[PDB]
Amino acid sequence: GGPEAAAFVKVSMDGAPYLRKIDLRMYKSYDELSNALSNMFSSFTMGKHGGEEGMIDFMNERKLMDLVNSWDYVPSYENKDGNWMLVGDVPWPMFVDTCKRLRLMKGSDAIGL
């Protein structure tokens, strides 16, 4: 049993501005989720109008350096309990359902911003 018809998860990035919702019901597997979110998330920071200040080419490029440079940080989400868990920590079946809030931990907040 699970969303498979109605799922909602928010998405934010510590530091740089990020706000969007998604449906995991679309992806019953963490694999497609990761791909769907990976592609969908990139779309968010991509548009004709947006971080014209350079946050589009500034915060975005810092992410790669920040991730490896700050390889101490890894993606983690909040379950129905509200506890933070690093991606892959809890079973996908439990995650897809409890899936309430998702936020990728990025140490770039110091470099990207």
Side-chain angles (χ1 to χ4, degrees):
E4 32 169 292
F8 307 111
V9 181
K10 313 103 82 82
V11 81
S12 180
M13 266 292 198
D14 186 350
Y18 274 83
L19 269 166
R20 177 174 175 82
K21 253 157 65 175
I22 58 176
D23 339 79
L24 283 60
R25 48 184 180 84
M26 294 271 177
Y27 326 110
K28 295 179 180 179
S29 215
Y30 78 105
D31 286 346
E32 27 269 36
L33 176 159
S34 180
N35 212 85
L37 270 56
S38 178
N39 192 32
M40 287 289 175
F41 287 10
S42 63
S43 180
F44 180 80
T45 180
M46 183 179 289
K48 264 67 199 301
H49 296 83
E52 59 177 358
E53 290 174 349
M55 291 189 289
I56 57 174
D57 289 346
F58 193 77
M59 290 173 176
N60 181 279
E61 82 97 305
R62 255 63 162 173
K63 172 259 273 38
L64 290 172
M65 290 68 174
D66 177 68
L67 250 171
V68 286
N69 184 179
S70 207
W71 187 246
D72 170 70
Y73 266 42
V74 301
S76 177
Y77 33 56
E78 237 212 339
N79 70 166
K80 67 191 181 299
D81 191 348
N83 94 121
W84 291 114
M85 265 295 176
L86 285 59
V87 77
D89 286 352
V90 295
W92 157 260
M94 264 59 183
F95 183 62
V96 73
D97 182 67
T98 196
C99 246
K100 249 81 179 302
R101 190 183 190 280
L102 186 139
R103 43 144 64 188
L104 316 94
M105 322 185 76
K106 212 170 85 184
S108 76
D109 65 0
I111 313 96
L113 170 59

mmCIF file of all heavy atoms in Angstrom, residues 18-59:
data_model
loop_
_atom_site.group_PDB
_atom_site.id
_atom_site.type_symbol
_atom_site.label_atom_id
_atom_site.label_comp_id
_atom_site.label_asym_id
_atom_site.label_seq_id
_atom_site.Cartn_x
_atom_site.Cartn_y
_atom_site.Cartn_z
ATOM 1 N N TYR A 18 15.497 27.008 -3.316
ATOM 2 C CA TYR A 18 14.907 25.886 -4.049
ATOM 3 C C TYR A 18 13.553 25.525 -3.442
ATOM 4 O O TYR A 18 13.482 25.167 -2.269
ATOM 5 C CB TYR A 18 15.834 24.668 -3.984
ATOM 6 C CG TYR A 18 16.868 24.735 -5.091
ATOM 7 C CD1 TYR A 18 18.036 25.496 -4.938
ATOM 8 C CD2 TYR A 18 16.653 24.026 -6.278
ATOM 9 C CE1 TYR A 18 18.980 25.547 -5.970
ATOM 10 C CE2 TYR A 18 17.598 24.077 -7.310
ATOM 11 C CZ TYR A 18 18.761 24.837 -7.155
ATOM 12 O OH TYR A 18 19.695 24.889 -8.171
ATOM 13 N N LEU A 19 12.486 25.588 -4.233
ATOM 14 C CA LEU A 19 11.162 25.228 -3.728
ATOM 15 C C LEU A 19 10.321 24.588 -4.822
ATOM 16 O O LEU A 19 9.912 25.248 -5.777
ATOM 17 C CB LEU A 19 10.431 26.464 -3.184
ATOM 18 C CG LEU A 19 10.722 26.646 -1.689
ATOM 19 C CD1 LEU A 19 10.282 28.044 -1.255
ATOM 20 C CD2 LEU A 19 9.947 25.602 -0.871
ATOM 21 N N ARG A 20 10.046 23.305 -4.658
ATOM 22 C CA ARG A 20 9.225 22.589 -5.626
ATOM 23 C C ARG A 20 8.650 21.314 -5.020
ATOM 24 O O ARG A 20 9.239 20.725 -4.114
ATOM 25 C CB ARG A 20 10.039 22.287 -6.889
ATOM 26 C CG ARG A 20 9.202 21.465 -7.873
ATOM 27 C CD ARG A 20 9.978 21.299 -9.181
ATOM 28 N NE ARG A 20 9.248 20.428 -10.094
ATOM 29 C CZ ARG A 20 8.255 20.893 -10.842
ATOM 30 N NH1 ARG A 20 7.913 22.150 -10.766
ATOM 31 N NH2 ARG A 20 7.620 20.092 -11.655
ATOM 32 N N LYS A 21 7.513 20.879 -5.552
ATOM 33 C CA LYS A 21 6.868 19.654 -5.094
ATOM 34 C C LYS A 21 6.920 18.614 -6.203
ATOM 35 O O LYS A 21 7.052 18.958 -7.379
ATOM 36 C CB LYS A 21 5.409 19.927 -4.700
ATOM 37 C CG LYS A 21 5.250 19.901 -3.171
ATOM 38 C CD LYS A 21 4.014 20.707 -2.760
ATOM 39 C CE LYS A 21 2.760 20.034 -3.311
ATOM 40 N NZ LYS A 21 1.551 20.750 -2.816
ATOM 41 N N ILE A 22 6.832 17.345 -5.832
ATOM 42 C CA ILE A 22 6.891 16.268 -6.814
ATOM 43 C C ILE A 22 5.994 15.109 -6.396
ATOM 44 O O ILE A 22 5.497 15.084 -5.269
ATOM 45 C CB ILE A 22 8.337 15.793 -6.940
ATOM 46 C CG1 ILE A 22 8.835 15.338 -5.563
ATOM 47 C CG2 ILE A 22 9.214 16.940 -7.447
ATOM 48 C CD1 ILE A 22 10.232 14.764 -5.705
ATOM 49 N N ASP A 23 5.801 14.143 -7.293
ATOM 50 C CA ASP A 23 4.980 12.983 -6.988
ATOM 51 C C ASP A 23 5.835 11.734 -7.128
ATOM 52 O O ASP A 23 6.355 11.446 -8.205
ATOM 53 C CB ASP A 23 3.798 12.908 -7.954
ATOM 54 C CG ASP A 23 3.538 14.276 -8.573
ATOM 55 O OD1 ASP A 23 4.258 14.635 -9.491
ATOM 56 O OD2 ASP A 23 2.622 14.943 -8.124
ATOM 57 N N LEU A 24 5.966 10.983 -6.047
ATOM 58 C CA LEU A 24 6.748 9.759 -6.086
ATOM 59 C C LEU A 24 5.903 8.614 -6.626
ATOM 60 O O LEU A 24 6.426 7.594 -7.070
ATOM 61 C CB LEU A 24 7.266 9.432 -4.696
ATOM 62 C CG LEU A 24 8.445 10.349 -4.390
ATOM 63 C CD1 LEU A 24 7.984 11.809 -4.442
ATOM 64 C CD2 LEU A 24 8.975 10.029 -3.000
ATOM 65 N N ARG A 25 4.587 8.804 -6.599
ATOM 66 C CA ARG A 25 3.669 7.792 -7.106
ATOM 67 C C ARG A 25 3.999 7.502 -8.554
ATOM 68 O O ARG A 25 3.740 6.413 -9.067
ATOM 69 C CB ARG A 25 2.228 8.278 -6.992
ATOM 70 C CG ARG A 25 2.115 9.694 -7.540
ATOM 71 C CD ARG A 25 0.704 10.186 -7.315
ATOM 72 N NE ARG A 25 0.539 11.543 -7.826
ATOM 73 C CZ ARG A 25 0.265 11.767 -9.107
ATOM 74 N NH1 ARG A 25 0.141 10.762 -9.932
ATOM 75 N NH2 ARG A 25 0.117 12.989 -9.539
ATOM 76 N N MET A 26 4.600 8.488 -9.194
ATOM 77 C CA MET A 26 5.010 8.361 -10.573
ATOM 78 C C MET A 26 6.105 7.320 -10.659
ATOM 79 O O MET A 26 6.195 6.554 -11.619
ATOM 80 C CB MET A 26 5.548 9.705 -11.046
ATOM 81 C CG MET A 26 4.413 10.722 -11.058
ATOM 82 S SD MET A 26 3.572 10.676 -12.660
ATOM 83 C CE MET A 26 2.291 11.895 -12.277
ATOM 84 N N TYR A 27 6.951 7.327 -9.638
ATOM 85 C CA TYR A 27 8.072 6.416 -9.566
ATOM 86 C C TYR A 27 7.935 5.518 -8.346
ATOM 87 O O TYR A 27 8.120 5.957 -7.212
ATOM 88 C CB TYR A 27 9.339 7.255 -9.486
ATOM 89 C CG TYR A 27 9.116 8.511 -10.298
ATOM 90 C CD1 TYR A 27 8.979 9.740 -9.653
ATOM 91 C CD2 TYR A 27 9.036 8.446 -11.696
ATOM 92 C CE1 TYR A 27 8.766 10.908 -10.396
ATOM 93 C CE2 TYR A 27 8.821 9.611 -12.441
ATOM 94 C CZ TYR A 27 8.688 10.843 -11.791
ATOM 95 O OH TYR A 27 8.478 11.993 -12.525
ATOM 96 N N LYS A 28 7.597 4.260 -8.592
ATOM 97 C CA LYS A 28 7.419 3.305 -7.508
ATOM 98 C C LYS A 28 8.759 2.773 -7.041
ATOM 99 O O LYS A 28 8.819 2.022 -6.074
ATOM 100 C CB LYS A 28 6.541 2.137 -7.952
ATOM 101 C CG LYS A 28 5.130 2.639 -8.263
ATOM 102 C CD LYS A 28 4.269 1.464 -8.731
ATOM 103 C CE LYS A 28 2.857 1.953 -9.050
ATOM 104 N NZ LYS A 28 2.032 0.805 -9.522
ATOM 105 N N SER A 29 9.830 3.159 -7.732
ATOM 106 C CA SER A 29 11.159 2.699 -7.348
ATOM 107 C C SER A 29 12.060 3.888 -7.069
ATOM 108 O O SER A 29 11.897 4.953 -7.658
ATOM 109 C CB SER A 29 11.778 1.837 -8.447
ATOM 110 O OG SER A 29 12.563 0.813 -7.851
ATOM 111 N N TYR A 30 13.008 3.714 -6.164
ATOM 112 C CA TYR A 30 13.906 4.805 -5.848
ATOM 113 C C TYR A 30 14.748 5.150 -7.068
ATOM 114 O O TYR A 30 15.203 6.284 -7.219
ATOM 115 C CB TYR A 30 14.807 4.447 -4.671
ATOM 116 C CG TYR A 30 15.916 3.540 -5.133
ATOM 117 C CD1 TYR A 30 17.217 4.035 -5.283
ATOM 118 C CD2 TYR A 30 15.645 2.197 -5.392
ATOM 119 C CE1 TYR A 30 18.246 3.181 -5.695
ATOM 120 C CE2 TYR A 30 16.671 1.339 -5.803
ATOM 121 C CZ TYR A 30 17.974 1.831 -5.955
ATOM 122 O OH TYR A 30 18.987 0.988 -6.362
ATOM 123 N N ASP A 31 14.949 4.166 -7.944
ATOM 124 C CA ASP A 31 15.737 4.395 -9.148
ATOM 125 C C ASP A 31 15.093 5.481 -9.996
ATOM 126 O O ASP A 31 15.705 6.518 -10.253
ATOM 127 C CB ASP A 31 15.834 3.111 -9.974
ATOM 128 C CG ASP A 31 16.786 2.125 -9.308
ATOM 129 O OD1 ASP A 31 17.506 2.539 -8.416
ATOM 130 O OD2 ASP A 31 16.781 0.970 -9.699
ATOM 131 N N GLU A 32 13.863 5.242 -10.451
ATOM 132 C CA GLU A 32 13.211 6.228 -11.281
ATOM 133 C C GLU A 32 13.020 7.515 -10.510
ATOM 134 O O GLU A 32 13.050 8.589 -11.093
ATOM 135 C CB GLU A 32 11.884 5.731 -11.852
ATOM 136 C CG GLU A 32 11.264 4.665 -10.957
ATOM 137 C CD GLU A 32 11.744 3.289 -11.403
ATOM 138 O OE1 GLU A 32 12.891 3.186 -11.806
ATOM 139 O OE2 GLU A 32 10.959 2.358 -11.337
ATOM 140 N N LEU A 33 12.856 7.424 -9.196
ATOM 141 C CA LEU A 33 12.713 8.635 -8.411
ATOM 142 C C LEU A 33 13.965 9.450 -8.545
ATOM 143 O O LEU A 33 13.927 10.639 -8.804
ATOM 144 C CB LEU A 33 12.529 8.301 -6.936
ATOM 145 C CG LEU A 33 12.486 9.605 -6.097
ATOM 146 C CD1 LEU A 33 11.799 9.372 -4.752
ATOM 147 C CD2 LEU A 33 13.905 10.131 -5.803
ATOM 148 N N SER A 34 15.084 8.805 -8.334
ATOM 149 C CA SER A 34 16.334 9.519 -8.392
ATOM 150 C C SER A 34 16.517 10.168 -9.757
ATOM 151 O O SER A 34 16.985 11.300 -9.851
ATOM 152 C CB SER A 34 17.502 8.579 -8.095
ATOM 153 O OG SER A 34 18.720 9.309 -8.161
ATOM 154 N N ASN A 35 16.149 9.454 -10.813
ATOM 155 C CA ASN A 35 16.286 9.991 -12.161
ATOM 156 C C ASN A 35 15.275 11.111 -12.407
ATOM 157 O O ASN A 35 15.613 12.163 -12.950
ATOM 158 C CB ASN A 35 16.067 8.878 -13.184
ATOM 159 C CG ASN A 35 16.929 9.134 -14.416
ATOM 160 O OD1 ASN A 35 18.097 8.753 -14.449
ATOM 161 N ND2 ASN A 35 16.420 9.777 -15.427
ATOM 162 N N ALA A 36 14.030 10.863 -12.016
ATOM 163 C CA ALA A 36 12.968 11.840 -12.207
ATOM 164 C C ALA A 36 13.280 13.115 -11.447
ATOM 165 O O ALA A 36 13.147 14.211 -11.975
ATOM 166 C CB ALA A 36 11.640 11.263 -11.721
ATOM 167 N N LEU A 37 13.714 12.966 -10.207
ATOM 168 C CA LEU A 37 14.060 14.120 -9.387
ATOM 169 C C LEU A 37 15.324 14.787 -9.919
ATOM 170 O O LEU A 37 15.437 16.006 -9.934
ATOM 171 C CB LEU A 37 14.271 13.671 -7.948
ATOM 172 C CG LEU A 37 12.934 13.736 -7.196
ATOM 173 C CD1 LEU A 37 11.865 12.908 -7.920
ATOM 174 C CD2 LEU A 37 13.090 13.223 -5.753
ATOM 175 N N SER A 38 16.277 13.970 -10.336
ATOM 176 C CA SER A 38 17.534 14.492 -10.856
ATOM 177 C C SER A 38 17.278 15.378 -12.071
ATOM 178 O O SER A 38 17.841 16.468 -12.191
ATOM 179 C CB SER A 38 18.466 13.342 -11.250
ATOM 180 O OG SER A 38 19.662 13.877 -11.802
ATOM 181 N N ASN A 39 16.414 14.909 -12.961
ATOM 182 C CA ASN A 39 16.068 15.661 -14.159
ATOM 183 C C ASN A 39 15.114 16.811 -13.842
ATOM 184 O O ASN A 39 15.249 17.911 -14.377
ATOM 185 C CB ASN A 39 15.414 14.721 -15.174
ATOM 186 C CG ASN A 39 15.307 15.404 -16.532
ATOM 187 O OD1 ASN A 39 16.154 16.224 -16.886
ATOM 188 N ND2 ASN A 39 14.310 15.111 -17.321
ATOM 189 N N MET A 40 14.138 16.536 -12.982
ATOM 190 C CA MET A 40 13.150 17.549 -12.621
ATOM 191 C C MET A 40 13.778 18.697 -11.842
ATOM 192 O O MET A 40 13.434 19.861 -12.045
ATOM 193 C CB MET A 40 12.012 16.923 -11.813
ATOM 194 C CG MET A 40 11.135 16.076 -12.742
ATOM 195 S SD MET A 40 10.183 17.162 -13.831
ATOM 196 C CE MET A 40 9.436 15.863 -14.846
ATOM 197 N N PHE A 41 14.679 18.364 -10.933
ATOM 198 C CA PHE A 41 15.330 19.371 -10.108
ATOM 199 C C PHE A 41 16.170 20.316 -10.962
ATOM 200 O O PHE A 41 16.184 21.525 -10.733
ATOM 201 C CB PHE A 41 16.229 18.683 -9.082
ATOM 202 C CG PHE A 41 15.425 17.996 -7.980
ATOM 203 C CD1 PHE A 41 14.019 17.833 -8.054
ATOM 204 C CD2 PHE A 41 16.112 17.513 -6.857
ATOM 205 C CE1 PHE A 41 13.338 17.198 -7.016
ATOM 206 C CE2 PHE A 41 15.418 16.876 -5.823
ATOM 207 C CZ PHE A 41 14.031 16.719 -5.904
ATOM 208 N N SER A 42 16.869 19.759 -11.947
ATOM 209 C CA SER A 42 17.704 20.573 -12.827
ATOM 210 C C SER A 42 16.840 21.563 -13.602
ATOM 211 O O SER A 42 17.246 22.697 -13.857
ATOM 212 C CB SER A 42 18.463 19.675 -13.805
ATOM 213 O OG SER A 42 17.533 18.992 -14.635
ATOM 214 N N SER A 43 15.642 21.121 -13.963
ATOM 215 C CA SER A 43 14.706 21.961 -14.700
ATOM 216 C C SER A 43 14.327 23.190 -13.880
ATOM 217 O O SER A 43 14.157 24.283 -14.419
ATOM 218 C CB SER A 43 13.445 21.166 -15.044
ATOM 219 O OG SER A 43 12.549 21.999 -15.770
ATOM 220 N N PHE A 44 14.167 22.991 -12.576
ATOM 221 C CA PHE A 44 13.774 24.076 -11.682
ATOM 222 C C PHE A 44 14.740 25.254 -11.775
ATOM 223 O O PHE A 44 14.318 26.403 -11.911
ATOM 224 C CB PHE A 44 13.759 23.574 -10.238
ATOM 225 C CG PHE A 44 13.357 24.706 -9.326
ATOM 226 C CD1 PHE A 44 12.007 25.048 -9.185
ATOM 227 C CD2 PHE A 44 14.336 25.419 -8.627
ATOM 228 C CE1 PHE A 44 11.637 26.103 -8.344
ATOM 229 C CE2 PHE A 44 13.967 26.477 -7.787
ATOM 230 C CZ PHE A 44 12.617 26.817 -7.645
ATOM 231 N N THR A 45 16.033 24.969 -11.686
ATOM 232 C CA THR A 45 17.040 26.024 -11.746
ATOM 233 C C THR A 45 17.309 26.453 -13.188
ATOM 234 O O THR A 45 18.220 27.242 -13.445
ATOM 235 C CB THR A 45 18.339 25.542 -11.095
ATOM 236 O OG1 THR A 45 19.313 26.575 -11.168
ATOM 237 C CG2 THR A 45 18.851 24.299 -11.823
ATOM 238 N N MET A 46 16.518 25.930 -14.124
ATOM 239 C CA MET A 46 16.685 26.267 -15.538
ATOM 240 C C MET A 46 15.426 26.940 -16.085
ATOM 241 O O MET A 46 14.321 26.419 -15.942
ATOM 242 C CB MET A 46 16.980 24.995 -16.338
ATOM 243 C CG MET A 46 17.230 25.349 -17.809
ATOM 244 S SD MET A 46 17.605 23.840 -18.740
ATOM 245 C CE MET A 46 19.247 23.516 -18.046
ATOM 246 N N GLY A 47 15.607 28.095 -16.722
ATOM 247 C CA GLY A 47 14.479 28.827 -17.295
ATOM 248 C C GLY A 47 14.947 30.101 -17.991
ATOM 249 O O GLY A 47 16.083 30.537 -17.807
ATOM 250 N N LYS A 48 14.057 30.705 -18.774
ATOM 251 C CA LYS A 48 14.389 31.942 -19.472
ATOM 252 C C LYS A 48 14.653 33.041 -18.454
ATOM 253 O O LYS A 48 15.573 33.845 -18.610
ATOM 254 C CB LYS A 48 13.235 32.361 -20.396
ATOM 255 C CG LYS A 48 13.489 31.878 -21.833
ATOM 256 C CD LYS A 48 13.439 30.348 -21.898
ATOM 257 C CE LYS A 48 14.137 29.870 -23.173
ATOM 258 N NZ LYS A 48 13.462 30.464 -24.362
ATOM 259 N N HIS A 49 13.840 33.052 -17.402
ATOM 260 C CA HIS A 49 13.981 34.034 -16.337
ATOM 261 C C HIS A 49 14.220 33.320 -15.011
ATOM 262 O O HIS A 49 13.531 32.354 -14.684
ATOM 263 C CB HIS A 49 12.719 34.893 -16.239
ATOM 264 C CG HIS A 49 12.554 35.690 -17.503
ATOM 265 N ND1 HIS A 49 11.962 35.164 -18.640
ATOM 266 C CD2 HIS A 49 12.899 36.980 -17.824
ATOM 267 C CE1 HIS A 49 11.969 36.123 -19.583
ATOM 268 N NE2 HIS A 49 12.528 37.251 -19.138
ATOM 269 N N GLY A 50 15.204 33.792 -14.259
ATOM 270 C CA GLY A 50 15.530 33.182 -12.979
ATOM 271 C C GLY A 50 16.666 33.932 -12.300
ATOM 272 O O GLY A 50 16.745 35.158 -12.376
ATOM 273 N N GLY A 51 17.539 33.190 -11.630
ATOM 274 C CA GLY A 51 18.666 33.794 -10.935
ATOM 275 C C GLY A 51 19.593 34.512 -11.911
ATOM 276 O O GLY A 51 20.712 34.069 -12.164
ATOM 277 N N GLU A 52 19.117 35.627 -12.448
ATOM 278 C CA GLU A 52 19.900 36.416 -13.391
ATOM 279 C C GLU A 52 21.152 36.981 -12.727
ATOM 280 O O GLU A 52 22.109 37.362 -13.401
ATOM 281 C CB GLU A 52 19.041 37.554 -13.938
ATOM 282 C CG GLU A 52 18.558 38.420 -12.775
ATOM 283 C CD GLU A 52 17.766 39.611 -13.302
ATOM 284 O OE1 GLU A 52 17.656 39.735 -14.511
ATOM 285 O OE2 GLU A 52 17.278 40.379 -12.489
ATOM 286 N N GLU A 53 21.135 37.031 -11.401
ATOM 287 C CA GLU A 53 22.270 37.552 -10.648
ATOM 288 C C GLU A 53 23.500 36.690 -10.893
ATOM 289 O O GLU A 53 24.631 37.123 -10.673
ATOM 290 C CB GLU A 53 21.943 37.568 -9.153
ATOM 291 C CG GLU A 53 20.884 38.635 -8.871
ATOM 292 C CD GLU A 53 20.438 38.556 -7.415
ATOM 293 O OE1 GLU A 53 20.790 37.588 -6.761
ATOM 294 O OE2 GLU A 53 19.751 39.464 -6.977
ATOM 295 N N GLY A 54 23.263 35.464 -11.345
ATOM 296 C CA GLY A 54 24.346 34.528 -11.616
ATOM 297 C C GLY A 54 24.182 33.275 -10.779
ATOM 298 O O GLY A 54 24.968 32.340 -10.887
ATOM 299 N N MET A 55 23.145 33.251 -9.955
ATOM 300 C CA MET A 55 22.905 32.090 -9.116
ATOM 301 C C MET A 55 22.701 30.868 -9.999
ATOM 302 O O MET A 55 22.850 29.733 -9.557
ATOM 303 C CB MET A 55 21.676 32.313 -8.233
ATOM 304 C CG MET A 55 21.985 33.390 -7.190
ATOM 305 S SD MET A 55 20.636 33.471 -5.985
ATOM 306 C CE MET A 55 19.388 34.210 -7.068
ATOM 307 N N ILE A 56 22.365 31.112 -11.256
ATOM 308 C CA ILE A 56 22.148 30.027 -12.196
ATOM 309 C C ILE A 56 23.461 29.401 -12.650
ATOM 310 O O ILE A 56 23.534 28.191 -12.863
ATOM 311 C CB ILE A 56 21.372 30.544 -13.402
ATOM 312 C CG1 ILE A 56 22.115 31.717 -14.052
ATOM 313 C CG2 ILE A 56 19.990 31.009 -12.948
ATOM 314 C CD1 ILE A 56 21.403 32.113 -15.347
ATOM 315 N N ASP A 57 24.488 30.224 -12.800
ATOM 316 C CA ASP A 57 25.790 29.736 -13.233
ATOM 317 C C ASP A 57 26.787 29.799 -12.090
ATOM 318 O O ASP A 57 27.924 29.346 -12.212
ATOM 319 C CB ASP A 57 26.283 30.589 -14.395
ATOM 320 C CG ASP A 57 25.461 30.294 -15.645
ATOM 321 O OD1 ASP A 57 24.749 29.304 -15.641
ATOM 322 O OD2 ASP A 57 25.556 31.064 -16.587
ATOM 323 N N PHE A 58 26.349 30.370 -10.978
ATOM 324 C CA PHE A 58 27.214 30.495 -9.808
ATOM 325 C C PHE A 58 26.936 29.373 -8.814
ATOM 326 O O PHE A 58 27.779 28.513 -8.583
ATOM 327 C CB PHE A 58 27.000 31.854 -9.143
ATOM 328 C CG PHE A 58 28.099 32.105 -8.142
ATOM 329 C CD1 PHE A 58 29.374 32.487 -8.578
ATOM 330 C CD2 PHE A 58 27.840 31.959 -6.781
ATOM 331 C CE1 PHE A 58 30.390 32.721 -7.644
ATOM 332 C CE2 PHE A 58 28.854 32.193 -5.844
ATOM 333 C CZ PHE A 58 30.130 32.573 -6.277
ATOM 334 N N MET A 59 25.747 29.378 -8.233
ATOM 335 C CA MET A 59 25.377 28.348 -7.270
ATOM 336 C C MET A 59 25.384 26.970 -7.925
ATOM 337 O O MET A 59 25.751 25.978 -7.297
ATOM 338 C CB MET A 59 23.987 28.629 -6.692
ATOM 339 C CG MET A 59 24.044 29.850 -5.774
ATOM 340 S SD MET A 59 22.367 30.297 -5.265
ATOM 341 C CE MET A 59 22.827 31.634 -4.140
#
